[PDB]
Design a protein around this ligand. Structure first.
Ligand SMILES: [Fe+3]
Ligand SMILES: [Fe+3]
Ligand SMILES: [Fe+3]
Ligand SMILES: [Fe+3]
Lengths: 225, 564, 225, 564
């Protein structure tokens, strides 16, 4: 047979699916592991039959188990499911979003203190700036990137972006499509404003003293036209 | 900029004032404080915060963290709050706001995210200290993965394996057996500490054991827990700063409970299975829990009290102790009264610890679920505690978490190293998804490394595909296990080079401050009372008021999560 | 799924039960492991259905397999069976005494040399003694415990129990209920009679020389009233 | 029982809400919190609390303190509160409530008063961290007793003795001189750290010095503070994690202040005598104080600004620099403007440190008095800070204490060892009687031992009879001085066994985290502004507003306390 350790795992998953199928036939509402195994075995079966595409299965398995076919809170507990199976074209990952239909019960439910918005970067002075991606390809700029050092494809008053970053949620990026014009909101960088790295236009504190040198480097490197 | 509350919570997890349901229980944890600066939160990923010269520093720092657990919701006796956790040199380096002071505001000074920092996203996860199971019967090495898979990182007890003495008692008896077991311990990821045979009316035999590496002594009636044995054992434990654990004289042969208490003489002692189903003076062993010197714990099979607890016991006692089928009952009248009281006593903070009694009248991977099942049961019967401040169960949560984390650590003299999420302590932590809190952990960190976790298909394109099951990680292997695991010993053994002498490669640390720990020393479970048992009805009374609870028909963290 | 190592074990047990069920349906007499797995799977099924109590199942599974449904000697080989299963109230241990009905065949059968009784503690001088448990709780005393040092709740002529133990099988205990009066049979302790420990009333050889000192300690500590 | 407020205060010192006048100044310290349990306070004496089995424990503990400072009023950047201070192994073991958990309520767990504990009554005394003088000329070993007698326990600087180079600059130049001085340091009780000659346009000569044990470099105009020298020095400092100190180009030979600032390139530098009388770019050196990378200190002769400050300087400059009597003035117009502004800038938190410039245009035993004289002067001139919360000067106090304690420690990379009254730090503490706060200390503790104190007649029946004068204590003598004193070195030197190689018996510790300290890193003195000087009027402007102060006719902590 030459069974690989991954094939040995899949037998357990498939058997768990078979036990879950038996319990559903008995008329029992399936729990979290039973529901996952029941859907996984279906995906594994369809892949062996090699008549359905990954795209077909991803669509077919949404709400494969209905809210009343499982115990309460099971659907919320499993917002997505992933199962690798061998198709005629090889092993492919089948990703299902909402495999089990959810209900009103939620284990690990977060209840908010208020519905009021969170004021991020509170008290920082906002700078409105018109930016144009004059380049042939779209680009994104992260929340903590030194805006002044952004791709030379971006056209804006760089002097006004010196020592500033985007007033957007931490970890988010702003997209500027090829040819697109946007009004960005910039706020001054936190802490000491010791900008080291990125495009190396500054590599030091973003103070008034370093500014002329930084603008000259930006012009020399093609950021300022 | 203004961020929608739902969007904030999805991105960074809950903030100050938000309430989190623990698993499928009716227990709500409220975020007491958030140590972040809104807009400066750390997020890992492409185009995210933790990047060169941005969230990740380019400035070298003596405090560059080895690991950062971003946006964690800490649940500990110290508080239920939101913070970034920083690990360095396998210890909790800092708790607060991590990042880059060069580009960010309000960064905790010793929480530098740099080139040498690894990222772990804790946003929307609950981070707790690793559990300590003070009642381990070293019967099978297969108990260890089961324990880790249930959030337990430290195991105190005794044994030799599947022999009658271990089947019954938490004892690794004598020098040779202690040496053999301490050497066997090298194999595992679990932190260990061994107990010797405390049942002796001679000094020499007890001393030999402490010098052989024992962290304490177990006094078990199967070897005779007589008043002479009790006095001799405690006398040696007092000399050598080690703990004493006791399973009392069930059959009142040498005396009644008061005679045992008198023999103890106000000395520190760990009373295993205080309720008495697993053993001890019938029917009044529970009465010991009221005493200040008595450090009491509960074993898993009796907590929570269910409609099947009594029935299961009136046979589980016959398989463990190997009793005649001629024996039918006494336990049928005695047991309901104590088992019911036990749950209430836990809620009252009278019983300070929860443990397992593993394969010796108790379950290895059940300490954590059963603690929360009891907390939930009590919340459902007796409502939200009067002690609470707000629309939350924070005080009750802190009372229950202490039972398997900090309180066992205090009892066994390891509170300085492990037991809680505190700066300076060893990084033995568990990451939980709130929907699975108390039942199924995500990641087990020991000594700043991931040692065990839930993992999907090994061939798979991502770590999520089925079958997702618990597997040993890098921290549990090679020579890295010697860096992440601790074998606790007595000070005498430690100071006399037991590590070198036995050629132990694991971290060897001494147990200290066992003798002067009273009920007052515990966290959230310092309650002392006059506990009395009616010898006719078997009803338990706390300061003359009946102490009881109703049996559960169904429990939380069970049926929704498990296949079998 | 998050399958724990204990859940992985139960799948094997359950599959073994399913194979055993198949073989019984084929009309084959089940062997020792097949019989155990067949009963185990039944217990696991009933627990999932969560309609039966542990008490109900323990009763229901006695002679679950009949002597003719299993191979000879199988019942005697399996005098008891234990299986942990998850019920709505959590994991509980189901203990079945005589799960398989026994037959005339016995593997590992012990045939006695004679049916005559074994004279234990032969030739030791028996001392009859009236004892009363004046305490509110019942107590037991083991075969090798120094009777003289028994719970002060027991009322008897302690002088007569000095250096003696119960003439009962080794490892057995004698029960004296709260308020109960019994006639006990005491025999002198074996070996040197070096009594060390228990209640520390003696801590030395139980000779005539130590007796007065021991009786004074017993009186002082409240054993002798 | 009810105790009269006056009686409580006499017995235990002030409690929560009480205000203490600092010396004869108009500064009031308010007790923010009291860590005691009323009725459980520790008192030493016949029939008092600290006695066998009472306040002193009979139960052995791993945390038995070596010294207990009972009922201390801590004044530190960390807060102005009332607590017991516990010393163990020459470190601050704990701060809170000390005693015996066996007999007392609310005892801090790691603050055990036991058989091995010594008692020091701090009731009614102010306890502060030992001061750090970061501008020492190692000109005379006689500076050390003068410094200790004024609450200074650590000295950073340089010198070779009374030669012209040391008379001018805080420089111990080259390998041989550094080795010689580090070995000379063994004699003293004072913690030391030496600075090498930074004035080099060649790498090799700078590196040699760091490897020889230097904690940093001093750039001084007398050896040429050119932009080339500024760049080369900082480049090596950045590589070796050491601090740089600067006395700028007074005569603007190679460039103006902006040219020097440009040469620095936003790199961390300690700008000595920022006002400019002691030296630096005339008349605009003070303009540097506004910059984030500039860590600014002030030297004693100009603080506080008095009616005799300018007159004293227009001659004190001629004796130090050895100038012709033909030179009369420029300093008469330039100096009032900057000296006046300097005081205001201190109050604003713009100048972060105070230092001496010891026997090189500044006084050795004046750092502490002069800091409080300035605090007092500004409180008298600009009123109680708007930053204050209540009828106290706590914020201003915290701002001023940070100038000679924590902020110099942060600047020089020793903040992890010394600088503040915090758990885990070395026990370098000063005990003050409130009537003498800031002018005359009572006891100087270094490494948990008393090293220097005010002491009466050696023959006398008690330690109080006259003449009471400052004397060296046991901690300053024999081999105990090697246990209580630290010689700070670079990491490179430390890691390469400088201690062993030079046969130093003293505690040798490396300076670390010097390069990434900006203004943001300081405590209570993080203020940045646009500082400008009119080149015609010499007036100082803070963000376009005039920055000035009036000269004092009399100062606090002076005339009442000193004979001469
Ligand atoms: Fe037990
Ligand atoms: Fe046990
Ligand atoms: Fe100077
Ligand atoms: Fe100087």
């Amino acid at each position: 047979m030459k069974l690989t350790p991954k094939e040995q795992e899949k037998f357990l998953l498939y058997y768990a699916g078979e036990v879950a199928r038996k319990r559903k036939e008995e008329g029992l509402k399936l729990n979290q592991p039973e529901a996952i195994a029941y859907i996984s075995a279906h995906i594994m079966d369809e892949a062996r039959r090699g008549k359905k595409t990954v795209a077909q299965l991803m669509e077919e398995c949404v709400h494969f188990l209905k809210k009343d076919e499982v115990m309460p809170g099971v659907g919320n507990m499993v917002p997505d499911l992933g199962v690798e199976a061998n198709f005629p074209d090889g092993t492919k990952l089948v990703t299902v979003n909402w495999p089990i239909e959810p209900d009103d019960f939620k284990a690990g439910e977060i209840k908010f203190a208020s519905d009021k918005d969170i004021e991020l970067n509170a008290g920082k002075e906002i700078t409105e700036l018109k930016v144009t991606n004059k380049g042939p390809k779209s680009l994104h700029v992260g929340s903590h990137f030194h805006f002044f050092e952004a791709n030379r494809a971006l056209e804006f008053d760089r002097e006004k972006a010196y020592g500033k970053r985007l007033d957007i949620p931490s970890g988010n990026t702003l997209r500027i499509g090829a040819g697109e014009t946007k009004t960005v909101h910039l706020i001054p960088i936190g802490g000491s404003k010791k900008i080291i790295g990125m495009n190396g236009l500054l590599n030091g504190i973003a103070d008034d003293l370093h500014k002329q040198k930084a603008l000259e480097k930006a012009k020399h490197h093609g950021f300022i036209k | 900029m203004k961020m929608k509350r739902q969007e904030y919570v999805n991105t960074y997890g809950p903030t100050t004032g938000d309430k989190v349901r623990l698993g499928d229980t009716d227990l709500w944890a409220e975020v007491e404080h958030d140590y972040t600066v809104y807009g400066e939160e750390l997020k890992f990923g492409a185009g995210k915060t933790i990047r060169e010269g941005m969230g990740q520093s380019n400035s070298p720092d003596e405090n560059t963290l080895d690991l950062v657990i971003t946006n964690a919701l800490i649940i500990d006796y110290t508080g239920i709050y939101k913070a970034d956790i920083g690990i360095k040199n396998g210890k909790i380096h800092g708790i607060g706001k991590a990042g880059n002071k060069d580009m960010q505001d309000g960064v905790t000074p010793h929480m530098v995210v740099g080139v040498g920092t690894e990222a772990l996203a804790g946003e929307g996860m609950i981070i707790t200290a690793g559990g300590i199971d003070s009642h381990t019967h070293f019967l099978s090495p297969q108990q260890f993965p089961t324990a880790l898979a249930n959030g337990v990182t430290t195991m105190f007890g005794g044994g030799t394996g599947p022999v009658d003495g271990t089947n019954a008692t938490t004892i690794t008896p004598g020098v040779w057996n202690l040496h053999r077991m301490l050497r066997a311990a090298e194999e595992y990821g679990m932190n260990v500490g061994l107990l010797g045979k405390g049942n002796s009316s001679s000094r020499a035999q007890l001393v030999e054991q402490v010098k052989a590496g024992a962290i304490g002594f177990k006094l078990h009636e199967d070897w005779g827990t007589t008043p002479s044995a009790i006095d001799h054992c405690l006398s040696v434990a007092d000399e050598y700063d080690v703990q004493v654990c006791i399973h009392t004289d069930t059959v009142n042969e040498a005396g009644y409970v008061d005679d045992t208490l008198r023999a103890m003489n106000g000395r520190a002692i760990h009373a295993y299975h205080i309720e008495g189903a697993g053993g001890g003076h019938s029917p009044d062993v529970i009465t010991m829990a009221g005493e200040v010197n008595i450090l009491p714990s509960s074993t898993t099979p009796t907590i929570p009290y269910t409609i099947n607890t009594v029935a299961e016991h009136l046979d589980m006692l016959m398989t463990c102790h190997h009793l005649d089928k001629r024996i039918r009952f006494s336990q049928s009248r005695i047991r309901p009264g104590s088992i019911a009281a036990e749950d209430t006593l836990h809620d009252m903070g009278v019983i300070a610890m929860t443990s397992s009694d593993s394969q010796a009248m108790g379950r290895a991977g059940e300490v954590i679920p059963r603690t929360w099942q009891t907390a939930d049961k009590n919340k459902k019967e007796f409502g939200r505690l009067t002690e609470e401040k707000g629309d939350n169960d924070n005080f009750r949560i802190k009372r229950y978490i202490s039972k398997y984390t900090i309180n066992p650590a205090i009892t066994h003299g390891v509170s300085e190293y492990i037991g809680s999420v505190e700066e300076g302590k060893i990084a033995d932590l568990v990451v939980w998804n709130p929907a699975f809190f108390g039942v199924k952990p995500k990641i087990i960190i020991k000594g700043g490394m991931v040692v065990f976790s839930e993992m999907g298909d090994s061939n798979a394109s991502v770590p999520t595909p089925q079958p997702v099951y618990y597997r040993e990680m890098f921290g549990h292997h090679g020579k890295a296990k010697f860096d992440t695991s601790i074998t606790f010993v007595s000070k005498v053994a430690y100071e006399n080079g037991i590590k070198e002498k036995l050629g132990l490669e694991r971290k060897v640390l001494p147990v200290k401050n066992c003798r002067n720990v009273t009920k007052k020393d515990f966290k959230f479970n310092n309650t002392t009372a006059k506990i009395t048992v009616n010898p006719e009805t078997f009803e338990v009374f706390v300061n003359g008021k009946l102490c009881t609870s109703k049996p559960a028909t169904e429990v939380a963290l069970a049926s929704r999560y498990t296949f079998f």
